[PDB]
Design an enzyme around this catalytic site. Structure first.
Site, mmCIF file in Angstrom:
data_model
loop_
_atom_site.group_PDB
_atom_site.id
_atom_site.type_symbol
_atom_site.label_atom_id
_atom_site.label_comp_id
_atom_site.label_asym_id
_atom_site.label_seq_id
_atom_site.Cartn_x
_atom_site.Cartn_y
_atom_site.Cartn_z
ATOM 1 N N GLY A 1 45.061 31.038 32.028
ATOM 2 C CA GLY A 1 43.828 31.363 31.906
ATOM 3 C C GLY A 1 43.581 31.210 30.385
ATOM 4 O O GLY A 1 44.265 31.663 29.551
ATOM 5 N N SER B 1 40.557 33.930 34.032
ATOM 6 C CA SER B 1 41.523 34.874 34.061
ATOM 7 C C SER B 1 42.535 34.342 35.466
ATOM 8 O O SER B 1 41.918 35.018 36.568
ATOM 9 C CB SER B 1 41.263 36.336 33.880
ATOM 10 O OG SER B 1 42.508 37.129 34.234
ATOM 11 N N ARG B 2 43.473 34.011 35.032
ATOM 12 C CA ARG B 2 44.396 33.523 36.412
ATOM 13 C C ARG B 2 45.192 34.872 37.109
ATOM 14 O O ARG B 2 45.415 34.899 38.301
ATOM 15 C CB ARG B 2 45.599 32.763 36.131
ATOM 16 C CG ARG B 2 45.209 31.300 35.525
ATOM 17 C CD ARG B 2 46.126 30.575 35.352
ATOM 18 N NE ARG B 2 45.877 29.262 34.482
ATOM 19 C CZ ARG B 2 45.202 28.305 34.780
ATOM 20 N NH1 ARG B 2 44.583 28.008 35.923
ATOM 21 N NH2 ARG B 2 45.013 27.175 33.980
ATOM 22 N N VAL B 3 45.254 35.954 36.277
ATOM 23 C CA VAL B 3 45.557 37.262 36.999
ATOM 24 C C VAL B 3 44.689 37.898 37.659
ATOM 25 O O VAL B 3 44.760 38.603 38.949
ATOM 26 C CB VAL B 3 46.190 38.302 35.932
ATOM 27 C CG1 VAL B 3 46.947 39.503 36.683
ATOM 28 C CG2 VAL B 3 47.634 37.521 35.378
#
Ligand SMILES: Nc1ncnc2c1ncn2[C@@H]1O[C@H](COP(=O)(O)OP(=O)(O)OP(=O)(O)O)[C@@H](O)[C@H]1O
Ligand SMILES: Nc1ncnc2c1ncn2[C@@H]1O[C@H](COP(=O)(O)OP(=O)(O)OP(=O)(O)O)[C@@H](O)[C@H]1O
Ligand SMILES: CC(C)C[C@@H]1NC(=O)[C@H](C)N(C)C(=O)CNC(=O)/C(=C/c2ccccc2)N(C)C1=O
Ligand SMILES: Nc1ncnc2c1ncn2[C@@H]1O[C@H](COP(=O)(O)OP(=O)(O)O)[C@@H](O)[C@H]1O
Lengths: 59, 53, 179, 480, 500, 70, 478
Positions: E337, E361-363
């Site tokens: 991200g 944001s990938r998390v």
């Protein structure tokens, strides 16, 4: 910060004058080493080192 | 206003005291190197004999 | 090495290997090197403006006079035909080391201040053979006064791999205190 | 194996090695370069012969890091295309390009092996059943139904949601599917690979406590690995799934991700191997490379490979050659649009661009076909009247115009859905939605029964009854 | 005292005369513009350091059939043709220790601050492998930045590679610098890497660090525009090595490559000087692999490695707002991200200029605490929906009360996210601010008094009730208790604000 | 570093050089990869003639070059 | 005895020099070819070793013309990089790339020479004294203040006003500047150069008698000098400037005009030297050749160099690699636009795009910071509404939109200033207006006291009260 900085730099200056005196030592070493008859002594030394090279060859 | 003027003065003071301390450490270092130059004359005496193996 | 010169030299030397005329063409190219070393010979044979006809003519005359192997005269005519003649000196130079890699004759360079006895030459030669694993070793004679007192013998494919103790010791004991 | 070659040139991952005159390896035959690890021990690195270039010299790419290798090292021709452990031994296991085990458990049962490179099934073998399965996603099962025993392709730029949508397709289909799945990871972030591993761990589908009971076998061509592994792991996972489909004759699931990292590694290695550049930067061997992959991934009479794969497009542009070559090989395609991703409409499946071959009247029911056609038509009318609105104002449209505009925006909102796995991103829990529920809800929306409810009521909602409940809660919040 | 150290020196040099080891040494054919070919060296490894006679470090990359391609780490002036070059027997080692904390250093791990050399015991490879799949765990910790947008909507967790992408002068260096200097009392190790930047700009960053106190826990591996291409190319790898040494030893790390496009330009230059063929935009084919081999050494290590962590915040540069360019598309594909920084939002007063609509944001919410998750789960989705609506609600002329109320609350949310320079927001302030906004209290007062009422409310809660701080810290969850306290505070301070 | 100079064609030319003779009966395989093959000899082949290697793999002579056949 | 060798190949400015096996020169050693012309021996042909081609030969580029050099001519190697005279003697003179005087006067004292390739100052020898400096240009002093000791760039196309802008900056600053200026011209018009020298003499800056007290030293490699010259004239001017800085410890001004010609010279040199080309046509070592100039300029503990470097943007494309690489180096960039120049608002700087690093409140003061940010806000809002108003017109905007548009017009016109070197184009005198007037005028404009005023009265006025007076004169024209 400046205290520890100048301490480090003073140590580096000691290293500098060491380098210079050891340069003088190497020049005097070469000056005494210019003896060609001692080179033949160094040639027998390097013959011993040829033996040591054979030893490394074994290793 | 008071903190503005006094803090300008304070940071000025801190930097000029930095420069004074720097000059002092410079002079002290040079003196130590010269005393080391005498000591290293003694070193130059006691090195060249051993430098040859 | 993939140098086109080395390609041709390898072809010639391998033909010599599968015939058995190895030293007979080795001397041949050893003299061809000194033929082409003098500049007008190479310039004449290389510049293409000259007719390939009289090129071949003069080359045949040189074949008859100086004496060349059948296959080797053939190979030189093959070069003059396929137009690699800019690379003649280079091919004659790669023949040497491809033939050395054929016979396993690792030519080595030993370097000292003054001459060593052939006893020392045999010592270092046997040492190089026991570190290299060759069939034979032929030692080249050199002097290097830049060394102070020692020997630095070279071996390997090129003079790449090297062992040395004259001034390497000087600078390495320099660096210890110059840490 | 007997013949010993010497490494001659190493330009990074490109190894030109010379052999004895008579013993020259075949194309794709694997090479084991006898290396030397920095601790003095050897470091065996595998290679694969790509090109016989004469003078007893072959060009082989490195499946592993070449840093530490030298000219003149030994190499040995194992004579075979890369042999991967296949069968039930590999179930519940994580692999690499060479079929090595990297889940840090016991070594693979080497009893069965198979060479990676092989040939496609003949024209007779092709199984022909046109039938769809339900995936639980609204926009998918309405506008682009997926073909069981076929190939499904996902397109989209980076950051739009195709990795998460493959996660969603897994969470719906995989466990309930009584068959055997295989996950192929081509160019995938270690974080996402580990996430998948631990999520499938908790989900019990691997059954760590009793290995060889699992239903999934994982391969991982990560991104840190040099172009060799990224070139070969797709074929590796394909060879595993191919053994599964042929020898065990059971329906397989093949999640490949990505498919573009394949061509990425291809184009990376190509310039050095001696080829002239193609278009925008890809290799000349592009169409045949992707065809060699896709035509091996297919359904036969014995077993059926249902294969989902995501095609990462660069710079959102579908004109790139590798996306251009995937489209012809993929049955049902779903493209994600950064616009729909930006407006929060998730999943961002573009309803007008995405097409399927299954969406036919005879194949999926007349009412389903017609409702899909009306959804497409309404969204198209909206996107045509878009700038008419944007420069005239909304008042100067007709009754029918404003009506369909509102209903089209409502469809666009309703196409969103809370995912089970995207719970971390939305905050609300997921909602599996049935196909009949989708069809009915869209019939209601287009017929205009909900035709005074708020738009945001159709947002992040599974069923239309949930949408009405959300509207009622908002109607309470409004006056209160 | 001066001679006895030289005494130990001479007892060294007596045992230190010569040790016979076979060194590979060949000659030099080509030397030009940082690239020098070598004749021979048939046994030098790929990437093994060399030593030119002058004393110049090098790296052997192209092991070609006849010659060796060696890049120079330094200048190429004093190198002479035909001189000897000697292989080293090492592979890009870097001395690393804890002493580096506080040092500006070259890419050769040598100091340029003038504070004397750094003592280091271990040496770690510049190029190192990545932690495997099983050798990591998922990301669950939060990494606090201090900006409300970053730490609420697009979170960054300990061990998540988050790209700070943006145009020129949009605040990328400022965002990274604030992320660093917010970390004073969080016990992390920061590493600031500057590739191809002004010496003076680096000096400004270092002086700002020194005056803000964040220099104790921060290394600054800086290279200037005059640095050779190999040094500009290897800077981020050395920074990552310094970071990894702590990451393995159960520390928490943060590294900022700033910026990556200059490193990619240096690699392009050195590849084109090695006569390799160029790809799109004259970059070599594998700049993707170049960036991935660097970035994928960021992770959150598993429990069986000490749960070390390293978060990478690389900065790239979109020339003229173009993300379609080759390096930007590669890095937004590689990283976990990104954070987009748009010059338009920078101009229009919204600092920081975080374009949320194309930020991800990938998390996800797994990089926040329970409190901020509970208060702002749906925040980015609803803010994107409100961006759409406010963009669309100008075509329609007349609108109903519900849409107008959503629009007004969305504008108050936009006023919330404004964040000045060097003003960090703790997690307590962040949670209470998101609550006061997203609930619907702020709609009454107007857009000019939004910010000042927020300041007064935060000061009021910090003076009156420290148990809110205590709850949000020790419990980490937004309990009904803390919510009741915060609602009392909003009511009281809203009445007081109405009075004032 | 040139094509058709494989250090074996030179060897057989050294063997049988005497004058320039036809070779169309035979042809060696010099370079082969990714679906092409360079073939020395076949001096009388036509542009487009189906050539056939060992193992039954057919080919087509498209790029007839100086001393080789693409 | 300096080693000697033959010339092997001559292809353009490329000179391939064969040397004996023994002593081949290092990189950047000035090879001096003996040189032959119509009659006589022009030793003037000076080169610079750029490569070591192997087999005892090297490749060098020629700082002069190559037409006339024949195969087999000899070369000498001076063993050092190409040095140039510096110091007080060089004060008040015109020079070459070769350090050879052109100003039709006597020679220079070679006592203190300085090689051109001097490594950049270290990291301890910088200064972080952030500091503003006004120039009297309203927009430059307001929206992107200039820095002391730091670089400044006039990015723009052709004909939009980089030379006029830098000439006006000269007349403003240099005349009252307390140190020395070094005008170095890297490939601009020889006419511009001559005219600048004429102004330097008319105003008396280079005092025709007593030439030692002149405070301005010129270095001119024009647009007709070979690409070997136009690639190092910059370095020559920089060596002079940095000698002044390092030794005499003064504040130096260094006007480079313009570094894109230096970059392009590098491109034409590398294309012939045979390097593989990078993006669209440049050399691969572009960032490195750029930084090798830009990094020896920075201000040090002893002296400060506040260089103003014009940059030419090719084909109005800021995306090009040379401007896109110089942006990373300069501190405050002033982006001249063509649209503003066409509509007549001079100077044609772009108020939005022109962005500084010194525009920070803890540097300039919060009032200046506030008014600057508000001007940028209003101008951004106008730029956004531009697309809509192009089609429709100002008729169909909302009330706040119309107010902001009117304020934006008045702002963008008040942002104009008649220059003292523009009087030959406008006829209106120059108007110097510092920050004290600037901030207050813009405060009035964004407050709205002048809301009832017309627009054309702010066009080409210095003071805000000057604009008010011209407005009352416009109402005095009924
Ligand atoms: N929240 C904020 N409030 C006020 N000013 C800000 C804020 N964020 C950034 N800025 C301003 O933006 C300017 C540019 O910041 P920064 O130095 O990060 O630019 P940049 O993007 O690094 O440019 P480059 O990448 O070319 O170095 C700074 O002068 C800073 O004062
Ligand atoms: N204040 C001003 N008023 C009117 N015209 C101006 C003004 N400033 C600049 N100009 C215009 O700029 C033009 C010349 O611009 P200038 O030579 O300064 O830039 P340039 O052509 O890019 O310079 P160079 O090409 O040497 O870099 C003139 O025609 C002049 O009309
Ligand atoms: C007719 C002019 C161009 C003569 C040339 N002169 C130049 O171009 C300039 C003066 N330079 C750089 C030279 O000194 C000669 N080298 C050439 O570039 C050239 C370039 C050139 C190329 C093709 C045709 C003619 C010339 N010389 C041949 C020249 O002598
Ligand atoms: N169903 C969804 N709802 C909300 N956000 C989503 C959804 N799917 C994906 N995302 C967002 O997309 C981002 C990345 O998507 P990802 O699957 O990585 O796409 P890609 O692989 O193309 O980058 C995630 O951070 C997530 O927040």
């Amino acid at each position: 910060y400046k205290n520890e900085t100048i301490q480090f730099e003073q140590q580096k200056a000691i290293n500098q004058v060491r380098q210079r005196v050891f340069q003088q030592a190497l020049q005097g070493a070469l000056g005494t080493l210019n003896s060609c008859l001692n080179n033949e002594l160094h040639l027998r030394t390097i013959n011993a080192n040829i033996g040591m090279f054979g030893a490394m060859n074994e290793i | 206003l008071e903190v503005e003027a006094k803090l300008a003065e304070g940071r000025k003071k801190i930097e000029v005291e930095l420069q004074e301390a720097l000059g002092s450490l410079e002079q002290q270092k040079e003196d130590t190197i010269k005393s080391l130059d005498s000591q290293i004359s003694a070193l130059s005496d006691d090195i060249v004999k051993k430098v040859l193996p | 090495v993939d140098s086109t010169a080395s390609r041709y030299a390898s072809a010639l030397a391998d033909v010599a290997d599968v015939t058995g005329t190895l030293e007979a063409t080795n001397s041949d190219v050893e003299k061809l090197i000194r033929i082409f070393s003098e500049e007008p010979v190479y310039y004449f044979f290389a510049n293409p403006v000259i007719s390939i006809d009289n090129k071949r003519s003069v080359l045949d005359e040189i074949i008859t006079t100086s004496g060349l192997q059948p296959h080797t005269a053939n190979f030189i005519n093959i070069l003059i035909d396929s137009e690699r003649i800019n690379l003649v000196k280079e091919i004659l130079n790669e023949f040497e080391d491809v033939f050395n890699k054929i016979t396993g004759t690792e030519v080595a360079v030993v370097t000292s201040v003054v001459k060593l006895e052939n006893d020392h030459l045999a010592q270092i030669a046997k040492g190089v053979q026991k570190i290299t694993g060759a069939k034979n070793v032929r030692i080249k004679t050199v002097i290097d006064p830049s060394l102070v007192a020692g020997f630095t013998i070279r071996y390997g494919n090129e003079g790449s791999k090297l062992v040395d103790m004259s001034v390497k010791k000087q600078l390495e004991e320099i660096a210890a205190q110059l840490e | 194996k007997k013949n010993l070659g010497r490494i001659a040139q190493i330009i990074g991952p490109v190894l030109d090695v010379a052999f004895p005159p008579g013993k020259m390896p075949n194309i794709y035959n694997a090479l084991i370069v006898k290396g030397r690890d920095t601790a003095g021990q050897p470091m065996n690195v595998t290679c694969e012969v790509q090109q016989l270039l004469g003078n007893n010299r072959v060009r082989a790419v490195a499946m592993s890091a070449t840093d530490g290798l030298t000219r003149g090292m030994e190499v040995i021709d194992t004579g075979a295309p890369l042999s991967v452990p296949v069968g039930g031994a590999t179930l519940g296991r994580i692999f690499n390009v060479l079929g090595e085990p990297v889940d840090n458990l016991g070594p693979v049962d080497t009893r069965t092996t198979s060479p990676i490179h092989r040939s496609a099934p003949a024209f007779t073998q092709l199984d022909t059943k046109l039938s769809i399965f339900e995936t639980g996603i609204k926009v998918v099962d309405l506008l682009a139904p997926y073909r069981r025993g076929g190939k499904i392709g996902l397109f989209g730029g980076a950051g739009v949601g195709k990795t998460v949508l493959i996660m969603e397709l897994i969470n719906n289909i995989a466990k309930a599917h009584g068959g055997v799945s295989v996950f192929g990871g081509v160019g995938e972030r270690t974080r996402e690979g580990n996430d998948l591993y631990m999520e499938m761990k908790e989900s019990g589908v691997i059954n760590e406590q009793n290995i060889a009971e699992s239903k999934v076998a994982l391969v991982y061509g990560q991104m840190n690995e040099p172009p060799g592994a990224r070139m070969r792991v797709g074929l590796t996972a394909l060879t595993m799934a191919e053994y599964f489909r042929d020898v065990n004759e059971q329906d397989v699931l093949l999640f490949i991700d990505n498919i573009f990292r394949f061509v990425q590694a291809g184009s990376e290695v190509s310039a050095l191997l001696g080829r002239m550049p193609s278009a925008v930067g890809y290799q000349p061997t592009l169409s045949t490379e992707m065809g060699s992959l896709q035509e091996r991934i297919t359904s036969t009479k014995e077993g059926s490979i249902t294969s989902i794969q995501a095609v990462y497009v660069p710079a959102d542009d579908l004109t790139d050659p590798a996306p251009a070559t995937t489209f012809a090989h993929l049955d049902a395609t779903t493209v994600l649009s950064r616009g729909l991703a930006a407006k929060g409409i998730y999943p961002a499946v573009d309803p007008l661009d995405s097409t399927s071959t299954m969406l036919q009247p005879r194949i999926v029911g007349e009412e389903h076909y017609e409702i899909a056609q009306r959804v497409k038509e309404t969204l198209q009318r909206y996107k045509e009247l878009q700038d008419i609105i944007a420069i005239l104002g909304l008042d100067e449209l007709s009754e029918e115009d404003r009506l369909t505009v509102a209903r089209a925006r409502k469809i666009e909102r309703f196409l969103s859905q809370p995912f089970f796995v995207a719970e971390v991103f939305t905050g609300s829990p997921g909602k599996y939605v049935g196909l009949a529920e989708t069809i009915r809800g869209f019939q209601l929306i287009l017929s205009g029964e909900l035709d005074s409810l708020p738009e945001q009521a159709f947002y992040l909602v599974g069923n239309i009854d949930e949408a009405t409940a959300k509207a009622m809660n908002l109607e309470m919040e409004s006056k209160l | 005292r001066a001679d006895e150290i030289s005494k130990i020196i001479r007892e060294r040099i007596e045992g230190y005369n010569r040790e016979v080891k076979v060194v590979n040494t060949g000659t030099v054919l080509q030397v030009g513009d940082g690239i020098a070919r070598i004749h021979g060296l048939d046994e030098v490894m790929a990437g093994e350091l060399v030593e030119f006679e002058e004393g110049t470090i090098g790296i052997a990359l192209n092991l070609e059939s006849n010659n060796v391609g060696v890049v120079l780490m330094g200048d190429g002036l004093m190198i002479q043709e035909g001189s000897s070059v000697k292989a080293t027997g090492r592979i890009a080692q870097i001395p690393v220790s804890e002493a580096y904390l506080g040092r500006v250093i070259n890419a050769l791990a040598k100091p340029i601050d003038g504070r004397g050399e750094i003592t280091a015991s271990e040496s770690r490879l510049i190029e190192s492998p990545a932690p495997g799949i099983m050798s990591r765990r998922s990301v669950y910790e939060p990494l606090q930045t201090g900006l409300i947008a970053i730490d609420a909507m697009i979170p960054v967790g300990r061990g998540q590679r988050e790209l700070i992408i943006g145009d020129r002068q949009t605040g990328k260096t400022a965002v990274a610098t604030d992320t660093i200097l917010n970390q004073q009392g969080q016990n992390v190790i920061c590493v600031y890497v500057a590739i191809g930047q002004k010496a003076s700009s680096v000096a400004q960053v270092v002086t700002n660090f020194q005056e803000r106190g964040a220099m104790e826990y921060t290394i600054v591996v800086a290279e200037t525009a005059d640095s050779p291409a190999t040094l500009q190319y290897l800077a981020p790898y050395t920074g990552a090595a310094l970071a990894e040494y702590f990451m393995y030893r159960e520390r928490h790390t943060l590294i900022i490559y700033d910026d990556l496009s200059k490193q990619a330009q240096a690699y392009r230059q050195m590849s084109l000087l090695l006569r390799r063929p160029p790809g799109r935009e004259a970059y070599p084919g594998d700049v993707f692999y170049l960036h991935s081999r660097l970035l994928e050494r960021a992770a959150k290590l598993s429990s069986l490695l000490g749960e070390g962590s390293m978060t990478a915040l690389p900065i790239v540069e979109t020339q003229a707002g173009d993300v379609s360019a080759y390096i930007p598309t590669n890095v937004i594909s590689i990283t976990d991200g990104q954070i987009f920084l748009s010059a338009d939002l920078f101009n229009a007063g919204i600092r920081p200029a975080i374009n949320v609509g194309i930020s991800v944001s990938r998390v996800g919410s797994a990089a926040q605490i329970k409190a901020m998750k509970k208060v702002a789960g749906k925040l980015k989705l609803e803010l994107a929906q409100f961006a759409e609506l406010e963009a669309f609600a100008q075509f329609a002329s007349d609108l109903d009360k519900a849409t107008q109320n959503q629009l007004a609350r969305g504008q108050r949310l936009r006023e919330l996210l404004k964040q000045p320079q060097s003003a960090p927001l703790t997690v307590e302030e962040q949670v209470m601010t998101i609550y006061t906004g997203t609930n619907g209290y702020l709609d009454s007062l107007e857009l000019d008094q939004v910010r000042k009422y927020l300041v007064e409310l935060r000061t009021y809660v910090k003076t009156n009730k420290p148990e809110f701080q205590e709850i949000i810290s020790s419990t980490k969850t937004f309990t009904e208790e803390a919510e009741a306290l915060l609602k009392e505070a909003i009511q009281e301070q809203m009445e007081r604000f109405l009075l004032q | 570093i040139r094509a058709d100079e494989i250090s074996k064609i030179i060897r057989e030319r050294i063997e049988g050089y005497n004058r320039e003779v036809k070779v169309v009966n035979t042809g060696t395989v010099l370079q082969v990869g990714d679906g092409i093959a360079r073939i020395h000899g076949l001096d009388e082949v036509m542009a487009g003639e189906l050539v056939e290697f060992e193992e039954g793999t057919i080919g087509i002579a498209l790029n007839l070059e100086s001393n080789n056949v693409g």
